[PDB]
C-alpha cells in the first residue's frame, strides 16, 4: 500500500491571487512574490489533508496494494472520490492486464470504498500487486470547496507566513476546529 | 485592541490658492470613521493672547493603504459635532496593520 | 451518502451592506466597496462554519442526498436539520436511466430529526448496484432577513474575528458568545449503538 | 414537532427608541443608525427566548406535530400562552378540516399544556399530522413584559453593540442571574 | 545492520534559493550569496534531524543495508521508509568474491512497512560468515520539487530555528508546529516482542 | 525577538561633488530588506517654515558586518513606497548581534 | 576493562573553520584564536560521545579486558566499528603472541560485538589479559557524520563558548533531542 499521486497540482488551480486578499486586503498594506506566497498554500493544503485525510484540489491518484481487506470492502484511505478510473491487476512482470467489471465505487464520505458485487472481490496473483487509480478530492477548481475547510488552509497558510520559524503567539473556531469535522473518526485498532 | 466606540467626522480642506502664495482651507466633511479617543495629561498652554486648554487624545482608527481616502492624513482633522480633533501623525499601531494612531489636540480656548 | 449541494448560495443574498456596518469601517466615502469581495469572503467562511457545528443551512439551498442502502427500515434521518418540500425521490440502478418514484415517502418535518418516514411499512426497495438521489431544499429562508436572529448574529460575532484577525492568533468569551449562540441549534444525539 | 412562527414581530414594537436611553443617557454623549440598534435587540431578545423558552413580543406560532405525546397532556415548548387559536386537523393532502372542541388550553407558566376534556384527545390520521397555532407571549407591546427579563435583554442588547467580536471584558443580577428565574427547569430526561 | 549510504545528498538539489527567500534575508544586494554555506549548513543539519525522527529519506539517495543474518523467516523490512527500485541483492561469503542473486525476493513498495518478502518461502541463504548487501535508492524524489510539501515545510521551519539562534538557548509552539508537521510520517510501532 | 514582517528599500546615495566643497544626492535603491517598524510617540515640530509631522519609527533589521552592503549606516534611509525613513543611528539590539536598531523619523509636512 | 585510545584527534581534522561560520556568519560580527575555539569542540564532541557512546572522528582504540561475557560475544562499547585491527593475547610477560583466526568481526550500529566462529571463543591465560585494538568511529574527516549529530556538536560548543559559567538562559530538535538517537538503549540490568 503505497497511494503516490499521478499529478500534482499546478500552482494555476491554487489560489494565490486570492489568498493575498486574505493575508493584507482591507486592513493592511497593500509584500512578497508569487512563488513565496504559493509555497505558503500548498504548505498549509497538505497539512489539512494530511490531518483531514482529503484531497481538495481533486488530483488522480494510484493505490497499489498487495493484499485486499476483505473480500467486499478495501476502504480508500483519500476520502472524497470520484470516479475510479480503472482497476489495473498487473502480474509479475506485468504486461498489465486491466479488469472492468465485478466491483462498484460507492463514492461516500465517510467509507470511500470499492465493495464488489456479490461476495467475490478480484483477486491478486502471486507477486502482480493490483493498483487503483483514482481521482479523489472535492472540486477541479478552489472555489468548489467547503468554505470552513478552504478557510483553515487560509488561516494556517497565514500563520506560515506572518512568523517564520516555530516561535509564539486559541480562537473559538480556528484552524484545530475547523478542521475537525473533516477529520476520519475511527475507533477500530483490532483485527478486522 | 481597540474598542472603536465614537464616532468622528473626518475632515480635509480643499486648498483653494489665493494670490500671495498661500491658501483658502473651507474643511468640506470626508466620511465618518469609528475610532476610540484615550485623553492624555491636559493642562493650559500658553497660546497667542489666549490661554488655551490642551490634551493629548491618541485616536485609533482603523487602518487602509495610504492611497485612500480612509487613511487620515496629518493635514486633516476630526470633528464630533464642534469638538475639532486635529490630527499630529498617523503611525500604525499593531504589527500586522489593522489599526492607527491618530494623534490630537482638542484646544478649546478656555 | 455524500450529500453534496446541487447550487450555492448566490452571494447577492448575503448581507455584505450589514456586515459592513457591523463591522464599524466608514460611512461616506467615495470608496465604500474596497472589501466586498472580502467582507463576502468571510461571511461564507463563517456560515459554513456554524453550518458545521450546528449541521444547519441557513440559505436554503438544494440538496443532493446520494446513497446505496437505507439506514433503516423506514425512516431515513437527513442531516441537514431545517428541511420543507423534498423536490424529487428518483431510484437510480445500475447504469443510468433514473426513474421517479412518488413512492409514498413523506418528510415529517421536524427539526429534531428531519426523516423521511415511509407510510409503506417499507422504503421504496433499492435495485443491486444503484444509487437513491433524494433531492431537497434545506434551510431556514431563501433571505437572510427569515433565520433566527440569534443564529445570525453569531455568524456576525464569528465573521467579524475572521476579519479581525487573519492568521490564527489566541484571543474570556461573552455571556452569550459565539459558542453559547450556536449551541442551542446543535444536534443533541446520545446513540453510539446499532439500532 | 416545527414551531415556526406565523409572523415576526414588526420592529415598531420593538424599542429601539428606549433602548438608546438605556445606552447612552444620562451618563455619556447624547452614535448609530436604527437599523444597526434594531438589529442587536432582536439578536438579544432571540438569546433569551431561546434560552428562557419565552416568546417576549407575543406573536403567534404554529406548531405541527405528527404524534401526540399523551392523551391528556402535549405541554407546549414556548412558554407564556394565551387562546390557543385553532386546532387544525389536515389529513393527507388536507382539504384542512378543523376541529372546536374536546380540549382546554390551561394558562401556565411552568407547562402551558393543552389538557384535552376527559381522557380521549383528538386522533390523528395516517399522514395528516395535526398543527396547533397559537399566540404565545406577554403582551403585545414592549411594556407589557416582566422588567426584569426587559432589563436582561437590555443588559444583553448593549453587549452585542459596544463590543463586536468575540472579545473580553460577573456582576451580582447579571445577565445570567436575570433570566435565570425564566427557564423551563425539567428534569425528566425518561420515557414519559 | 549498519545502514550506511552509497553517496550523500550533492548540495545541489537542495533549495537555498529558496531557503534564502523563506529566511527573509535581503533581496537585491550586490553581496546576496554571504550565506551560501551557511544556509545549506543549516538544511542539511534539518533534514538529517527530521530522518532521524521520522526514518524518512526526502532526497532519494542510494543506501546499503549490510547486515548478517536475516530477522525473520522471509520479509526483512528496511528501516528507511520511502523506498524504490531495491537495485542489488548480493550475497558474499567469508571474503570478497559477491555473486549478486536475482534470489526471488520482490520488494513490496509501502510506506508503512518497506519490506523485501521472499517469493520462495525462504529468504536466500546467508554463508556461514558472510554478509548480505541490500543495494537500494530510498526516498520521496531526486530533486526538492518532488517531496511532500508538509514535510518540507517542516525542513524550513526547523532549519530557520538553527539559523536564528545558533547556541541551545530555549524559546508556545504553533498549531502545525516543527513536531505536528513530521508527527504523520513517524513510524508508529508497537511491538517490542520475539517475533 | 522580531517579527520582520514590513519590507523596505535601502538607499544609498552617490554623492557627486560640487564646485564649492558640498555633494550632490540623487538616492539610488541599495537592496531591499525586511524589517519591523515600531511607532513611537508622534506630534507636529516646528520646522522651518513648515509644520512637520514627525514619529520616532524604531526599524529593526538583520545584522551584518560593518563592511557589508546589508548595514544600514546613518547617512542612508529607508522608502515604502514614497514614505521615507531616515536613519539616525544604528545599535546592535541582541546580545548575540543577530539583529539592528534602525531610528527613522518619517516627518511628513502636514 | 579499560578502552584507552590509541592515538588523540590531531585537531586538524576536527573544523574549527566550520565552526566559526556557525558561530559568527550571516549574522552577527565577521573574535577569539584558535586555540580557544578548538578546546570548546572537542570538550563537546567528548560529551556527546560520552552521552551517546559514539568516537565521531574514527580513532584508534584498545579494549584490554580480563574476562569475556559470553563464549560468542562481547559486545564492544564504542559503537561505530570497522576493521578490528588485532587480537592480541598476552601472557603473564608478554611475549605478546596475536590471534589471527577464529572471530568474525560483525559490523552494526546497535551492538558492535566480536562472535567467534562456532560456539569456542579464543580463552585467556592466568593474568596474561586479552587486549582488542579497533578503530571505531563514523569516518576519518568531519563530513563523513550525521549531519544532525554533527550539527548537535556545534550547538553545544557553541554553548560552552557563548557562556562561560554554569549560568542560565527547551527548543525542538536541542542538543538533547538530537543525540537521543544516538544514545544506547539497553534495558538488561541482569546477569547475563
Known sequence: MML?????VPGTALPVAEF????????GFAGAEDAALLSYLRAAIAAIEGRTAKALISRGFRLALTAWRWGDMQT???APVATVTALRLVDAAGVETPVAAGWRLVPDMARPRIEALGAMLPMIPTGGRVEIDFTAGFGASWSALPVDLAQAVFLLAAQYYELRHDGAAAMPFGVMALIERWRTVRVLGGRP | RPRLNRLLVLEEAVRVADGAGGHRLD???KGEVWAEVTAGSGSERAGEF?????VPFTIVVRAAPV???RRPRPEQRFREGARIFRILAVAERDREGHYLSCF???????
Not at chain 2, 104 to 110: G, M
Open chain 1, 4 to 8: 503516490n499521486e499521478v499529478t500534482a
Open chain 1, 20 to 27: 493575498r486578499d486574505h493575508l493584507r486586503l482591507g486592513t
Open chain 1, 76 to 78: 480508500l484511505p483519500i
Open chain 2, 27 to 29: 474643511w468640506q466633511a
Open chain 2, 50 to 54: 489666549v490661554t488655551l486648554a490642551s
Open chain 2, 67 to 69: 492611497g485612500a481616502a
Open chain 2, 104 to 110: 490630537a489636540r482638542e484646544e478649546v480656548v478656555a
